[PDB]
Amino acid sequence: GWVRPDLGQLSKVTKVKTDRPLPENPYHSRARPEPNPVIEGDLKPAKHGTRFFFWTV
Amino acid sequence: MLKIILPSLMLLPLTWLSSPKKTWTNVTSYSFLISLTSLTLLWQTDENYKNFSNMFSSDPLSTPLIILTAWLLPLMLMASQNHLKKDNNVLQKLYISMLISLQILLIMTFSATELIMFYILFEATLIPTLIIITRWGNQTERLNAGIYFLFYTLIGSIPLLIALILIQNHVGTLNLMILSFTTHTLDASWSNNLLWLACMMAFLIKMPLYGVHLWLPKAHVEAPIAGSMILAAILLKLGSYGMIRISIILDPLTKYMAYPFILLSLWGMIMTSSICLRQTDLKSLIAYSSVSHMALVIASIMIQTPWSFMGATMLMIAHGLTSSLLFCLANSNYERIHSRTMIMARGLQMVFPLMATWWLMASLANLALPPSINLMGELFITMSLFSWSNFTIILMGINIIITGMYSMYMIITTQRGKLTNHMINLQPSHTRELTLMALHMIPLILLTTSPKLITGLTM
Ligand SMILES: CCCCCCCCCCCCCCCCCC(=O)OC[C@H](COP(=O)([O-])OCC[N+](C)(C)C)OC(=O)CCCCCCCCCCCCCCCCC
Ligand SMILES: CCCCCCCCCCCCCCCCCC(=O)OC[C@H](COP(=O)(O)OCCN)OC(=O)CCCCCCCCCCCCCCCCC
Numbered sequence: 445g446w447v448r449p450d451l452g453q454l455s456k457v458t459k460v461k462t463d464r465p466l467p468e469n470p471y472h473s474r475a476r477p478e479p480n481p482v483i484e485g486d487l488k489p490a491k492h493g494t495r496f497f498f499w500t501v
Numbered sequence: 502m503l504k505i506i507l508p509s510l511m512l513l514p515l516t517w518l519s520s521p522k523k524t525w526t527n528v529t530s531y532s533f534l535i536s537l538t539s540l541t542l543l544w545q546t547d548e549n550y551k552n553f554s555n556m557f558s559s560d561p562l563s564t565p566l567i568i569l570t571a572w573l574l575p576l577m578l579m580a581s582q583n584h585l586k587k588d589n590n591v592l593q594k595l596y597i598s599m600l601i602s603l604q605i606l607l608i609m610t611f612s613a614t615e616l617i618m619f620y621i622l623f624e625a626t627l628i629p630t631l632i633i634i635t636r637w638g639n640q641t642e643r644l645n646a647g648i649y650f651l652f653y654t655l656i657g658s659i660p661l662l663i664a665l666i667l668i669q670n671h672v673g674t675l676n677l678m679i680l681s682f683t684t685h686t687l688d689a690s691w692s693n694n695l696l697w698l699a700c701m702m703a704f705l706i707k708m709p710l711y712g713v714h715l716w717l718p719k720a721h722v723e724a725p726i727a728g729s730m731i732l733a734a735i736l737l738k739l740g741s742y743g744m745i746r747i748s749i750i751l752d753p754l755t756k757y758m759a760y761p762f763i764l765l766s767l768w769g770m771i772m773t774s775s776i777c778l779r780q781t782d783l784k785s786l787i788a789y790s791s792v793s794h795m796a797l798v799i800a801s802i803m804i805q806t807p808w809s810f811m812g813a814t815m816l817m818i819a820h821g822l823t824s825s826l827l828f829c830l831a832n833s834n835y836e837r838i839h840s841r842t843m844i845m846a847r848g849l850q851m852v853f854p855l856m857a858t859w860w861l862m863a864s865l866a867n868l869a870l871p872p873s874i875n876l877m878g879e880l881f882i883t884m885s886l887f888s889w890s891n892f893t894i895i896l897m898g899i900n901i902i903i904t905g906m907y908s909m910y911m912i913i914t915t916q917r918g919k920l921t922n923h924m925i926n927l928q929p930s931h932t933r934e935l936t937l938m939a940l941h942m943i944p945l946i947l948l949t950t951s952p953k954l955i956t957g958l959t960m
């Protein structure tokens with residue numbers, strides 16, 4: 445009682461049920477080092493202006 | 502300081518917006534008023550220095566130089582008025598603009614409280630002097646004189662810029678008062694010796710040594726009268742002012758590092774006075790006399806004695822006034838005869854009696870005469886040098902003898918003797934140039950009357 449599949453039936457996703465646990469760490473990844481400590485705060489103006497030699501402002 | 506700088510800045514729109522028949526009158530009158538305004542920072546009651554701004558400051562050393570510059574601008578206008586009479590109005594206004602810009606930049610240079618701003622205004626003053634000398638000089642050699650002046654100054658000043666940025670990167674500020682307070686001793690290394698040389702050689706070029714001095718007679722011969730005036734009365738003193746300012750951060754190693762320049766100054770003042778003796782050109786004679794007096798100033802600043810600094814300031818102001826007066830007198834004769842040969846006009850006391858009186862007073866100021874700030878400065882420099890080493894008195898005495906000899910030789914060979922009667926074109930006198938001599942000589946009398954103003958930092 446076998447029925448041959450149609451033109452576009454064997455070429456689709458299947459959603460197979462399994463009991464094997466999902467591998468939580470594929471590629472055997474390392475620690476992924478933490479990023480730089482981003483600075484937060486209010487943007488105050490530059491102290492005493494540009495501080496470029498004799499320019500006061 | 503802004504109350505002096507801004508009227509001088511507004512002198513330029515006045516110059517370019519005045520009518521061509523009122524330009525000289527307006528600019529001369531308002532520059533006289535600006536000098537009168539610049540007299541207001543002599544109000545020094547306390548020992549504290551007048552710090553007007555975060556970038557402008559006053560001083561017992563900076564104040565006479567500022568007042569001398571503001572006083573000398575109308576004098577340059579008066580001196581340069583006659584030799585520009587057959588000229589385009591645009592060229593006349595441009596010349597006046599050059600003089601006014603020189604006055605503005607020099608006042609800012611003397612009042613600047615930061616060494617880097619001092620350097621910037623130093624080269625800013627280097628520019629219009631070059632333009633004046635080259636564009637309005639008379640002979641062919643003005644271009645060579647401009648090249649010599651400009652590149653002597655620049656090859657001096659580039660190591661000064663490197664040294665200033667080094668000091669700023671080391672201590673963080675490059676402000677004169679902060680450096681004066683938290684100055685640090687130097688550990689006496691070869692790098693520190695090269696730092697000392699880099700920060701000294703710019704000013705040792707600018708006021709002439711016995712070595713690099715060859716630009717000064719060329720520039721003075723080839724320059725017009727206002728250029729000779731501004732050079733010989735402010736710019737050498739600008740070099741001396743820079744040396745006095747920057748010597749404070751070089752405390753431990755100046756006492757041996759100043760040896761070759763002291764010898765160079767003393768022997769060079771002797772040699773340049775000798776050149777004045779055997780000199781055939783009047784402007785060259787006045788230029789080499791300026792070299793000798795500035796050599797005295799170099800020696801005093803190098804030996805770093807309070808008497809030496811006070812005498813250096815007094816000789817600075819006195820020499821500026823008397824060298825400008827001598828240049829103006831020589832220019833009056835040159836405008837008569839159109840030649841700077843000294844032996845050619847001889848009996849001028851006959852036809853020019855009061856001009857001969859101004860000549861006599863100018864030469865008595867040129868040599869050290871005891872009721873004068875010239876002798877005050879020279880005598881206290883001599884006292885400090887004799888304290889430094891007792892054997893300097895021989896060189897000082899030789900210099901004084903030759904100084905009297907070339908000054909009286911000038912008077913006798915250009916005023917006394919039989920008049921060269923072939924010179925028909927000896928116009929009697931201009932009230933303008935007699936006024937110019939009077940405006941040079943009367944401040945000498947007043948500063949002799951009260952020499953506490955000309956006393957500098959140390960007392
Ligand atoms: C017009 C006058 C010209 C002649 C005299 C000029 C000065 C002569 C003595 C100084 C050396 C040359 C100028 C260097 C300027 C910078 C000085 C400085 O910052 O020193 C500290 C520095 C040292 O820096 P430092 O002090 O930070 O060193 C680190 C030190 N520790 C680790 C202890 C903190 O000196 C130099 O780097 C000097 C390098 C010079 C290299 C270039 C030389 C060019 C040729 C020399 C002559 C150039 C002028 C004449 C040209 C020809 C004219 C005809
Ligand atoms: C500061 C930087 C200057 C740089 C150049 C500036 C050029 C432009 C100058 C513009 C005007 C500024 C004048 C500055 C000098 C002012 C002189 C003056 O009035 O000084 C005050 C003095 C009295 O003050 P007092 O406190 O008594 O003096 C100190 C005493 N412990 O007053 C007096 O004593 C009275 C003075 C006037 C009265 C006439 C004096 C006549 C003197 C005759 C002398 C004759 C001999 C001359 C010999 C010369 C030889 C070469």
